[PDB]
């Protein structure tokens, strides 16, 4: 429809609108008029994405400012879903307005998802795809082929064809989803990745992941091309802090250190060979470093550094090279002695938790390495690798981790902690040391996002509680509110199962995973739910190892044999490719009525981004609360950091994280108010955590369901499934759960 919010005409691509969608648009428009950060818990099931897209495009085209739009999500699948919704929205806008306006919408992802070269396509790692695409498209290969046409080097035809046409002539106007962009670039023989990367400054709206805004290894180039006065939307941001922890962390193993020694020796051999052949290619770099030119001055815009910058651009030093690492052999010896100091530090028999300042002092007193040459380690390594013109970079991949560690631990000294553990896994007999430099303050990586952009709209389907995040991440919300969906009938029926069929209390604690009776209750529960579920069913587990153990011993006693009589079993493999096959097989098995059960981790890959709507959902079996491994040193260090700084209790934060993962997995089941699915929680500890649930979930959870047994839950599920199997009355839902245009006009007239 078409309706007006204040002076803003909104083109909604559906003939009916939920009331929660209209209230959501009103709050977003109020925030954009204010121009500050806000947190909005738009409930799942309802059109969270489509309302955001419709209102922000209406705000962009109507207002004379024409602010650009950034849409940051957590998974590439959600990016594609947002692109599809945006394509539908602009198709509706073109139909209503009668013309296709000047519009550009593109999704941004890595080279692995946007490569059309037939040779480098089957590589299972994204790093080798990036290094091969760089090797073919660094510009050195192009000038080498221009100077030597008979050279054995090759160029990618999908990248060269972009040189013939202009940047604005890469694609026609409109929105290009990844499937459509790949089809178009295959038809025109073009590289979609370089098309998207060059159209960042031209796109009215650009959708990418949180890694392209928070992780400075890839967000350095993207954040320069975007406008600082742009609208910023965060979709499914309830786990965004983990991305911040994922942005500024690094783990080093002794195998990585051995490969680093081998790479340093290979680098020394290469610099010795180049010094014998041509020292001019070293002398020009040396005098450029003398003049104070940084990596950006020596590198061209088309090429990329060998080592990505692991720190924030605002934290990079603007002064020149200190000179200890200016000479190539001196820098090689510097890196070698840094690697040997790291190898010395790894030979420990107990866990050492030390600040970066203490590590720097010990390194200076043992190796005479200062902080200032360490702050330029990654830049100097990238410049040396560029000037060496090495054909092979696989031997120097381990040096990237050393440069990342050197640059990270030198620039950052507050909010970071270095953990050295003698045992990576306690089950292994031989000791396997690991050194973890982790980011305890998640607000560090997200601080330049809030500093650069005035208006940030944090939104997740199950972001709760809304006041935890502005304390966790240093930002102020102008308004925070959580909507409750208006339902003619109770659309979803949550229940908390604290005890089994034989009234034995059930829990998913890691130490009691091998108890008979709790596993008997879980197996009988799963069999009964598979017997009573019509279409499909998804089961979530706190960890992969817990699921492995419980499924293996379920197969040992033959619980799964009874499940095979009703539904097919598909399990989340650690391999993402086989997991995708299992997921599409689950979707196929739900469609044709075979029935399937999908076992997955509540904190795994399937838990984030993947939706289970209608027949793909219908039952979310929660085996326990997805708590993290408490005995891990990183989690305890982060908990101590939040207790020290933000006064957040350790148990409170652990319960918050576990219940937000449970909330997102429960919210994956709903799309539309016609959709239904039961939300069963099989742990005794869920009962005290009803207030930590999202507000819309908490309304559906009655007080009588807080301590249900197995059989009572089965009876309630059967009654619920029989209840909505009837057709609903339209007169009971004509203007209370869904609104037409006339109902929206009547409500607008009632509001004034």
């Amino acid at each position: 429809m078409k309706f007006y919010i204040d002076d803003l005409p909104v083109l909604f691509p559906y003939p009916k609108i939920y009331p929660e969608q209209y209230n959501y648009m009103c709050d977003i428009k109020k925030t954009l008029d204010v121009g500050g950060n806000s947190i909005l818990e738009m409930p799942s099931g309802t059109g969270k994405t489509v309302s955001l897209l419709s209102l922000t495009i209406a705000y962009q085209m109507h207002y004379p400012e024409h602010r650009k739009i950034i849409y940051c999500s957590r998974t590439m699948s959600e990016i594609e879903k947002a692109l599809v919704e945006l394509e539908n929205l602009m198709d509706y806008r073109t139909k209503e307005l009668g013309y296709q306006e000047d519009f550009r919408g593109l999704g941004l992802t890595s080279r692995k998802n946007l490569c059309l070269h037939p040779e480098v396509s089957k590589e299972r790692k994204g790093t080798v795809v990036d290094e091969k695409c760089r090797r073919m498209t660094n510009g050195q290969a192009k000038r080498k082929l221009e100077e030597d046409p008979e050279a054995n080097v090759e160029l990618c035809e999908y990248h060269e064809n972009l040189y013939n046409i202009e940047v604005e002539d890469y694609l026609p106007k409109g929105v290009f989803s990844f499937e459509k962009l790949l089809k178009y670039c295959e038809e025109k023989t073009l590289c979609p990745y370089f098309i998207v990367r060059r159209m960042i400054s031209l796109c009215n709206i650009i959708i990418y992941s949180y890694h392209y805004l928070l992780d400075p290894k890839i967000a350095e180039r993207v954040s320069n091309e975007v406008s600082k006065d742009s609208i910023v939307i965060f979709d499914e941001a309830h786990n965004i802090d983990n991305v911040c922890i994922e942005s500024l962390s690094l783990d080093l193993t002794t195998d990585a250190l051995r490969r680093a020694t081998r790479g340093a020796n290979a680098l020394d051999e290469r610099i010795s060979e180049v010094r014998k052949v041509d020292s001019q290619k070293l002398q020009d770099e040396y005098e450029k470093l003398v003049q104070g030119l940084h990596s950006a001055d020596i590198l061209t815009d088309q090429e990329e550094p060998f080592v990505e910058t692991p720190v924030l651009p605002q934290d990079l030093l603007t002064e020149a090279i200190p000179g200890n690492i200016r000479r190539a052999e001196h820098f090689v010896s510097f890196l070698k002695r840094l690697i040997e100091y790291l190898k010395t530090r790894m030979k420990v028999l107990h866990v050492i938790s030390e600040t970066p300042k203490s590590f720097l002092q010990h390194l200076k007193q043992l190796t005479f390495i200062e902080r200032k040459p360490l702050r330029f380690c990654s830049e100097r390594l990238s410049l040396l690798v560029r000037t060496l013109e090495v054909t092979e970079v696989e031997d120097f991949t381990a040096l990237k981790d050393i440069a990342t560690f050197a640059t990270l631990i030198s620039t950052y000294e507050e909010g970071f902690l270095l953990i050295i553990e003698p045992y990576e896994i306690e089950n292994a007999a031989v000791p396997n040391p690991i050194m973890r430099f982790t980011c305890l303050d998640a607000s560090i990586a997200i601080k330049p996002v809030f500093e650069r952009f005035s208006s940030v709209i944090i939104t997740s389907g199950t972001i709760s509680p809304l006041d935890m995040y502005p304390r966790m991440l240093n930002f102020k919300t102008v308004l925070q509110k959580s909507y409750a969906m208006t339902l003619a009938k109770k659309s979803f029926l949550p229940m908390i199962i604290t005890k089994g069929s034989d009234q034995v209390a059930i829990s998913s604690r890691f130490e009691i995973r091998n108890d008979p009776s709790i596993v008997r209750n879980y197996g009988s529960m799963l069999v009964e739910f598979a017997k009573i579920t019509p279409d499909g069913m998804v089961v979530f587990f706190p960890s992969y190892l817990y699921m492995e153990s419980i499924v293996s011993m379920w197969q040992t006693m033959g619980i799964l044999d009874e499940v095979w009589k009703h539904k097919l079993i598909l399990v989340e493999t650690p391999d993402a490719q086989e997991t995708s096959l299992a997921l599409e097989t689950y979707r196929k098995a739900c469609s044709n009525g075979r029935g399937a059960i999908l076992l997955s981790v509540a904190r795994g890959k399937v838990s984030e981004g993947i939706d289970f709507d209608h027949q793909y959902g219908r039952t979310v079996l929660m085996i326990g609360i997805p708590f993290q491994y408490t005995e891990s040193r990183i989690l305890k260090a982060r908990l101590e950091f939040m207790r020290e700084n933000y006064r957040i209790r350790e148990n409170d934060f652990l319960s918050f994280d576990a219940m937000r993962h449970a909330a997102q997995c429960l919210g994956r089941v709903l799309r539309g108010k016609d959709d239904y699915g039961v939300m069963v929680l099989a742990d005794r500890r869920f009962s005290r955590k009803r207030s930590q649930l999202p507000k819309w979930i908490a309304q559906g959870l009655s007080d009588a369901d807080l301590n249900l047994s197995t059989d009572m839950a089965i009876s309630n599920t059967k009654q619920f499934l029989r209840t909505m199997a009837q057709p609903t009355d339209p007169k009971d839902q004509e203007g209370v759960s869904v609104w037409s245009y006339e109902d929206l006009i009547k409500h607008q007239n009632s509001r004034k």
């Binding site: 200190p322 000479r327 190898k343």
Partner: protein, 131 residues
């Protein structure tokens, strides 16, 4: 060998008394038992074949890095940095001249490490340490 001390020919397994007693003069895998046997009487030459530099027992130490070349580079860096200790405040904030001084001290450390200009750089170090 990384495990066995060829001077006494003792494996680490059945003879756990072997230790990483290195020499600043010439770094070698001599154990403490071989040190307490040969050099307790007095100074002598290097017990390893192919090397005969005169060494003292009291100069012995333990290696802190796995690589011998890195260990001798760090020890030469210590032997140069003791008198070469000019800082930023020593140059009164002159950043470029501080970089030139760092390049010079790294170059003389490299020359002492590889021995290409050991005599002239040693003379320069001996003249500098008197000042």
């Amino acid at each position: 060998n990384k495990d066995m001390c060829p001077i006494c020919k003792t494996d680490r397994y059945l003879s756990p008394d072997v230790k990483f007693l290195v020499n600043p003069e010439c770094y070698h895998r001599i154990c403490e038992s071989c040190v307490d046997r040969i050099f307790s009487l007095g100074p002598a030459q290097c017990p390893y074949k192919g090397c005969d530099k005169i060494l003292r027992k009291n100069k012995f130490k333990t290696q802190i890095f796995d690589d011998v070349e890195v260990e001798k580079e760090v020890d030469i860096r210590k032997r140069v940095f003791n008198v070469f200790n000019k800082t930023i405040d020593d140059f009164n904030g002159d950043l470029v001249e501080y970089n030139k001084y760092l390049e010079e001290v790294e170059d003389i450390i490299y020359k002492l490490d590889h021995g290409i200009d050991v005599a002239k750089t040693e003379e320069k170090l001996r003249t500098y340490e008197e000042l």
